[PDB]
Design a binder for this molecule. Sequence first.
Ligand SMILES: [Ca+2]
Ligand SMILES: [Ca+2]
Lengths: 89, 101, 67
Amino acid sequence: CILVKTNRVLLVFEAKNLQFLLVFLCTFMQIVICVIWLYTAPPSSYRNQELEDEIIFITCHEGSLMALGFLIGYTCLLAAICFFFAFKS
Amino acid sequence: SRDCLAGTRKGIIEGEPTCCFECVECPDGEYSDETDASACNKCPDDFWSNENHTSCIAKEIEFLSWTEPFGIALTLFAVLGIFLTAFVLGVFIKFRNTPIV
Amino acid sequence: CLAGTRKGIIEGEPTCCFECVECPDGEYSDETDASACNKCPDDFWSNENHTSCIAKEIEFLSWTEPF
Ligand SMILES: [Ca+2]
Ligand SMILES: [Ca+2]
């Protein structure tokens, strides 16, 4: 949403309610990756006992750290684009 | 020989009959709850022996929770952020007809 | 019994009959027959097979470390 309200961002996509269309597409690329991740290797709770001989901790195995990084990485690619256009103006 | 007490274990004296022995303490991951025990029993999978190796006591579960000094602090911040966002939204709504909005 | 184990007592049997039991961590034995598992000297820790003790390790941020 912040990106759609920047000085030189909306004009390029137009002539290719459009603001809403672009808020929709990026959110849809985020929705799809999470669904694919859940269907293949869902993160779940794990009991760890090798760390301590007296107490046990309950963690959340996150599945491949490749997926968690890809969420943050996609989020950054968007923030960097927004930051670049705002800096040029 | 004097009898071995609970939490101890029998030991061999070389060259002597089995009636005569010595008492040795059990290790940390085991316990003994009888008298004149030839071995120390092992605690179950989710149990750990107490200081005096006579019984098994349940382990303590450690996790991040609401009633912890670290937890109470983080929540307050989230509620404060929610309240601030609600206040901003209520201001744009009530002042819907100003030129700025 | 082997080098890594100690003797055990069978109830109601003479001393000539026994069982072999592993030594605990922090102790070792290196004998063909052993009545007890000998304790490991200070600043030393038992091997994986408990055959003989070895020295411990010093942990610190060294100058020659890659980090
Ligand atoms: Ca004799
Ligand atoms: Ca008998």
